[PDB]
Amino acid sequence: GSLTEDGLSYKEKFVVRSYEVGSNKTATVETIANLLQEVGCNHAQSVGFATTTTMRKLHLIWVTARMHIEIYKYPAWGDVVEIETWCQSEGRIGTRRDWILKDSVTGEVTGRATSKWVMMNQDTRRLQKVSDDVRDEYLVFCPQEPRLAFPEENNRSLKKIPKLEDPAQYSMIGLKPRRADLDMNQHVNNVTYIGWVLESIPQEIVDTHELQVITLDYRRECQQDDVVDSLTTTTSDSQFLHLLRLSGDGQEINRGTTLWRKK
Amino acid sequence: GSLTEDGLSYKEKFVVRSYEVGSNKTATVETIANLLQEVGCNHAQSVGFATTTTMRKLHLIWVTARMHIEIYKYPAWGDVVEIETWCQSEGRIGTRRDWILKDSVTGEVTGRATSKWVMMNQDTRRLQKVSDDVRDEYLVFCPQEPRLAFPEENNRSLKKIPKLEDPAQYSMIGLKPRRADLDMNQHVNNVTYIGWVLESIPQEIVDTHELQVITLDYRRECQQDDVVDSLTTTTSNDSQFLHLLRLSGDGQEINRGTTLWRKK
Numbered sequence: 001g002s003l004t005e006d007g008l009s010y011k012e013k014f015v016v017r018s019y020e021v022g023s024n025k026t027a028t029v030e031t032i033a034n035l036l037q038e039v040g041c042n043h044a045q046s047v048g049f050a051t052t053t054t055m056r057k058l059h060l061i062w063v064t065a066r067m068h069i070e071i072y073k074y075p076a077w078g079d080v081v082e083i084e085t086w087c088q089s090e091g092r093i094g095t096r097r098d099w100i101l102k103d104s105v106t107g108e109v110t111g112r113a114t115s116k117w118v119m120m121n122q123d124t125r126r127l128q129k130v131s132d133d134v135r136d137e138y139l140v141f142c143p144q145e146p147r148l149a150f151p152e153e154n155n156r157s158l159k160k161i162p163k164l165e166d167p168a169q170y171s172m173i174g175l176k177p178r179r180a181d182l183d184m185n186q187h188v189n190n191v192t193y194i195g196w197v198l199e200s201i202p203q204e205i206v207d208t209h210e211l212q213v214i215t216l217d218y219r220r221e222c223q224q225d226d227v228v229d230s231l232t233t234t235t236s237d238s239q240f241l242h243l244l245r246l247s248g249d250g251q252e253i254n255r256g257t258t259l260w261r262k263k
Numbered sequence: 264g265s266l267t268e269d270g271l272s273y274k275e276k277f278v279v280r281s282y283e284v285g286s287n288k289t290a291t292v293e294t295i296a297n298l299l300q301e302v303g304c305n306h307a308q309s310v311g312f313a314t315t316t317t318m319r320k321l322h323l324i325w326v327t328a329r330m331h332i333e334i335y336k337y338p339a340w341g342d343v344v345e346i347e348t349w350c351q352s353e354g355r356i357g358t359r360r361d362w363i364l365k366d367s368v369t370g371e372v373t374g375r376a377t378s379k380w381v382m383m384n385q386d387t388r389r390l391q392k393v394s395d396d397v398r399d400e401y402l403v404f405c406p407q408e409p410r411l412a413f414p415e416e417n418n419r420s421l422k423k424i425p426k427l428e429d430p431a432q433y434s435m436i437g438l439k440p441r442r443a444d445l446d447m448n449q450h451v452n453n454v455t456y457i458g459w460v461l462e463s464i465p466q467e468i469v470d471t472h473e474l475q476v477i478t479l480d481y482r483r484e485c486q487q488d489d490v491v492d493s494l495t496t497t498t499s500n501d502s503q504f505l506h507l508l509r510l511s512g513d514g515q516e517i518n519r520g521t522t523l524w525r526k527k
């Protein structure tokens with residue numbers, strides 16, 4: 001991949017692999033979300049990084065607060081998908097990373113995503129607003145004018161998600177992460193939580209519908225030795241409300257919604 | 264990727280991804296085994312397929328009986344790895360698929376693998392010898408002279424694996440596959456079983472050693488709604504382990520294997 005002409009966004013092409021596709025011989029949403037993460041990392045590498053000089057001295061990291069993916073067409077096995085990604089400052093709240101997924105043959109937009117990121121101290125895990133010093137450093141890598149993947153004011157990407165109330169309609173209990181679910185820093189990958197959310201959707205929905213929209217709020221990380229319960233309730237196309245919580249005390253780790261279309 | 268000049272082997276280059284690497288910033292053995300599977304599939308596609316005309320008419324499929332991976336150097340995140348793969352007939356027993364992993368910059372061999380495949384009826388799950396009619400159809404895609412990734416007289420790839428006896432030294436109880444662990448035909452991916460085997464190795468071994476050799480025998484398939492227990496016992500400067508995968512309930516064997524680890 002490479003940075004675009006203006007050096008304010010990064011493009012990369014991926015060939016869809018045999019093991020990355022589902023029953024429909026098209027890429028799963030977890031494969032897509034893994035590709036978005038990879039193109040995000042390559043953009044950080046190409047511009048010099050993933051934290052700023054001041055962030056390293058202050059022991060601060062970027063953590064995901066929310067992920068919103070919208071797919072119109074999942075790429076088939078062997079197809080080439082092209083993803084363009086960019087970052088933008090959101091004042092002192094944090095940073096937003098957006099993506100556009102395109103068909104490499106037609107050039108049509110097949111999907112789009114947006115994510116919200118906040119600053120946190122590696123140790124202590126305290127949320128802190130973005131400093132004036134750590135702002136000047138990365139603003140040179142972001143476009144100055146707003147460039148939104150979801151320009152619609154008050155759309156699905158910015159809707160507040162409610163808490164699922166017991167009893168849930170569907171459930172998947174006792175989910176545990178394995179070594180492959182960890183990243184290079186031995187933390188659970190943000191993509192595993194997507195897989196866990198979807199585990200409680202009935203197989204009959206998965207077989208008869210396609211995932212169109214997925215919005216996921218991150219509240220607490222799942223440790224290597226933690227166990228998770230995945231809960232789902234229909235709120236409706238098919239709409240669902242999801243809750244990820246610890247098998248024991250029931251401490252919330254994630255909340256979200258999914259929208260599915262009949263095939 | 265592309266087939267080589269003679270049309271008897273397939274080469275492909277992969278850039279190592281951020282999510283594909285472990286704590287050491289090098290590709291995990293599950294990422295490697297996934298790449299071997301992908302290059303295997305692209306070889307089947309390039310030559311016209313992953314079953315022959317006769318195999319589809321008789322509802323027969325190719326199933327893995329054994330996998331043997333040996334890694335000298337795991338590629339780093341961002342490095343380009345090049346894999347060459349080929350198939351060879353083993354008479355009526357079945358087919359063997361071999362791989363060579365190379366560093367794309369130096370051209371040095373960083374790893375190698377071999378796997379044994381048998382014919383099975385997709386519906387009855389009954390195994391069978393390869394008929395001559397099937398053998399004539401795919402022999403045109405295989406080299407005629409033997410081309411072994413593991414030439415050695417006394418090689419690790421062909422050693423019989425014993426059954427782990429209880430009590431195991433280490434264990435990882437209640438492992439269940441999730442949707443991402445399934446392939447396009449809703450069967451558990453052969454690579455997930457590698458991850459499950461390794462789950463019972465203590466984290467202290469993983470942190471202080473590197474996986475050099477892994478041999479895994481496939482006996483039974485894990486269904487979507489099956490639960491697995493992963494057992495490990497040390498059998499040994501190097502560390503050797505004996506592994507057993509079995510169903511949490513009745514204890515029906517699904518896999519058996521060995522791993523060899525060296526100090527970092």
Ligand SMILES: NS(=O)(=O)c1ccccc1OC(F)F
Pocket residue numbers: 040043044047049050051052062087088095138141142
């Ligand atoms: N290092 S990074 O991944 O956070 C990054 C990459 C490209 C542009 C900006 C940016 O950081 C900004 F959000 F602070």
Ligand SMILES: NS(=O)(=O)c1ccccc1OC(F)F
Pocket residue numbers: 303306307310312313314315325350351358401404405
């Ligand atoms: N089994 S397969 O269809 O994946 C295949 C791929 C390339 C060459 C031969 C071949 O068949 C036979 F050698 F087993």
